[PDB]
Amino acid sequence: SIDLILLAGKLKRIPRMGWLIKGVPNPESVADHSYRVAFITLLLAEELKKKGVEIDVEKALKIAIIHDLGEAIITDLPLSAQKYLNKEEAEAKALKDVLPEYTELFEEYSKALTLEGQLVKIADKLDMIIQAYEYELSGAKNLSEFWNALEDLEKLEISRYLREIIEEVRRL
Amino acid sequence: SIDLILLAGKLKRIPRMGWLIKGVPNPESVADHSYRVAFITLLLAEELKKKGVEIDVEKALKIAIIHDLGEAIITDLPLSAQKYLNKEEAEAKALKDVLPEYTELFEEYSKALTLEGQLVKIADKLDMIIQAYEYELSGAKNLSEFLEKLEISRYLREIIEEVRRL
Amino acid sequence: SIDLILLAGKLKRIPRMGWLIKGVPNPESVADHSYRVAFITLLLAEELKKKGVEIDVEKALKIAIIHDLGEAIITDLPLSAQKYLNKEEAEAKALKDVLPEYTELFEEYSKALTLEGQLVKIADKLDMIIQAYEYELSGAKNLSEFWNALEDLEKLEISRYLREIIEEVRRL
Amino acid sequence: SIDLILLAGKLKRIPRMGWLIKGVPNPESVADHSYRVAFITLLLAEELKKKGVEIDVEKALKIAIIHDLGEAIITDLPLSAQKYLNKEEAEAKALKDVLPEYTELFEEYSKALTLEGQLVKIADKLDMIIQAYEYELSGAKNLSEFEISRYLREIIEEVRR
Amino acid sequence: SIDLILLAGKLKRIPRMGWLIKGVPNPESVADHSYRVAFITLLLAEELKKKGVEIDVEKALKIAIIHDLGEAIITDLPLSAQKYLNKEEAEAKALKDVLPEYTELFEEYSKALTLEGQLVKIADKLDMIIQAYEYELSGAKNLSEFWNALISRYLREIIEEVRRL
Amino acid sequence: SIDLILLAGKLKRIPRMGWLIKGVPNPESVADHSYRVAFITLLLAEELKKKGVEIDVEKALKIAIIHDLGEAIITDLPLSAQKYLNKEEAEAKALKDVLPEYTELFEEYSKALTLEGQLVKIADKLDMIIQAYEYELSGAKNLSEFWNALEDLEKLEISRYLREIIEEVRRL
Ligand code: NI
Ligand code: NI
Ligand code: NI
Ligand code: NI
Ligand code: NI
Ligand code: NI
Predict the structure, then answer these.
(1) How many A from CA of D98 to the centre of ligand 6?
(2) Which chain F residues are closer than 8 Å to C138 by Cβ?
(3) Which of F43-49's residues contact partners 24+ apart within 8 Å by CB, and which partners?
(4) Architecture of domain C1-172
(5) Count of B-C CB contacts under 8 Å
(6) Which of B126, B141, C42, D149 has the fewest CB atoms within 10 Å of its CB?
(7) What is the CATH topology of the domain spanning E1-165?
(8) Ligand nearest to the CA of C65
């Protein structure tokens, strides 16, 4: 379907709103972010294989590609907005309406039960933390709280097989 | 309060999402929009005065200033998102938290029963309609989707005609 | 008239030039600026009603909305240019030519002859000083001179009633 | 490695130069582009599957992720530049130096040597064609110039329409 | 002086205001504009020289380089602003205070006192006309008035090529 | 020829890639850069005349104007790309094909052996280093390497006549 392709194209324009609201001047798009979540997911999957941890790599990659696709309809609701609206719920509804196909993949990510869902959750957070560091390098002085995501990572069981990359990142 | 001023400053950075998702390259901010909504309200309140219609202009200007201030917290949710989320309810909740003193003014705007509430509603739509035509002059070919249902439009036929004649 | 509305739309596009020349990447428009001047005017008006000071709020909001509308013709000439050009008088004359009712209001702001005019002058400078702080948070190191406006706030009769918000903003 | 992740981040900032040179004012980044190639690759692989065509979906998705990663080092060289400079050859070397393990995947893509490589080449072209249509909707008037296809006749004609 | 180079760097940021007000989304800077005015001045000067005209190429190039430099202080005054403010006068005063050594060259430009001064004026207009055509290719529909701008007996090949756009 | 002029117009839009890849948010164009290189060349030529060093100013300004014009075709290849591609060779070829009459001028620039070639090489590096300082003022923390080009100037004989400006630049 061309409509689905045009729908994913909205992620090239929809900004990542956390950065924007902080006054980061040319904030990345949701497509920008999702691209690197996929790349990170690929790298972390290979690291998990090295450690003998069984990962369905194909599944993890699909989840990374689709995980923020609901934002093509909902937009990237910032934390401030999430006090008053249920972001994942509206994303899930909108995903169900255009790609029911991938409804179970979003739930995996969203519920973060499966190793594959947790991995993408970790890739998601790593993209964001690393991106905060890069925006500080270009001048942002107000992104310290985007590092509170590391404490969240350790919450996930799979994080115990990724202590070396989590440390590489701490070392920023 | 500097914090409230900072809050209002977020409107300088929050984009108007309709234009952005359509592909308008440097879409206006919510402050840009709210500015001209206040200007249009002032202008139309004077044309109403001439026609012998009574308008509390102070109230109408206050309403225009605050009408999208909730979007500093909520952002400017596009129509696509409004299928899944209640825009106006979320803005009302947010405003009640930070600016409870402007809770009634936002309710006037949303209900659009008073002349002042309806005026700002009309001003809101005119800014958008006129902005679509302006972005079309600079290349947008996909804004065709961007008033008579409001009682007050009968006092404002001339400006509505001028807009339509664009 | 739709021409006046089109004229006001120009403030959405016209940059605030002092930021731009300093290297602030995506500086606010004159409309962004005037929007928050109106907001600040409304806050301070209410603050002055508390203190029992009589302000015509309608008039003060009108002045805030129109105070930079002549820049739609003149543009926002920076300090450097104001050494060679009479900006306030060029604006008054431009405004006279498009809406003579708006010339009187501009003059209240410009010459600070009324309490309402003074209030907008202060709101105008508070927007700017706070905006410099915000642009500092996102990387700007060369904006210290935009705090020199704080001293100018004290020159007006109205500032005797705003010794608080002044201190709030000095603290920054 | 954080270096690789930093390297891939450069794609969020490196512009798709074809559009930029045509005068498109806020051109997509290489990441933006690669995101939608990955999405299109997925969608099309599932259409191939519906038809009973064998395809390693995992491999195709990996290739889509990495297929423009060399551009994080080389940048996205426009056509005008490719008359003087060998873009694929430069991207292949750059990639080898950072991700030697994906050298053969890149080769499958760049020389369209497998069904998976072909699929990503197709998704890659479809993103650019559809993006040119999108930039025409927002104002561009100068974008007209912008085997496994036997299984993809439906989507190819949806695009033509 | 580093202050002079910082002064010239302001032109990389100061936008060409006519396009901006028209709604052209990422308008060229004054430096972008001056760069191509200098390039066109070089082309035009070499065309005159080949056709047998006595032309000081070095001078015309210096003039092209400095001709909008007063806009580092004054900014790029649009037509609307010029009904109320004297632009060239303001530019001349500002140049006088920072680059007094280029006052006489700016005068050649501003008053078209020399052939080299005139040539830069011609390059200046050509840049603008051709840039309107470029911004129309990318979507602008409201730039017709910027084609109104269209020795020239030695420049008829180029002026006809521009007309043909 | 309108084609030549359209070609030079490409420099208005082509970014200086070094900045962009660093995260500088609205980086200068090649034309922005090339403008100030021409400016600095003029300025330095005049400083050299005061020190008794004759320069062919006409030639030096032509060189400054054409020196990055091949980037209209090739783009501004960053250092990362230069490890795999011959930038200078590809620009010379592109120039030869469009402006064969300025081939020797771009040779002088690229070799930087003649007085005029050295002069424009100095101006080019000075524009870059000073631009790096300007971008740091607006928030970049990751541009220190660009100052290493100061070291490359001493290797050009003519810089012994330009010690006062080179010291001002170091003083930033
Ligand atoms: Ni995400
Ligand atoms: Ni509104
Ligand atoms: Ni103001
Ligand atoms: Ni590609
Ligand atoms: Ni000029
Ligand atoms: Ni250069």
Answers:
(1) 29
(2) 139
(3) F43/E1, F43/E4, F43/E5, F44/F119, F44/F122, F44/F123, F44/F162, F44/F165, F45/F119, F46/E101, F47/F161, F47/F162, F47/F164, F47/F165, F48/F119, F48/F158, F48/F161, F48/F162
(4) Orthogonal Bundle (1.10)
(5) 112
(6) D149
(7) Hypothetical protein af1432 (1.10.3210)
(8) 3
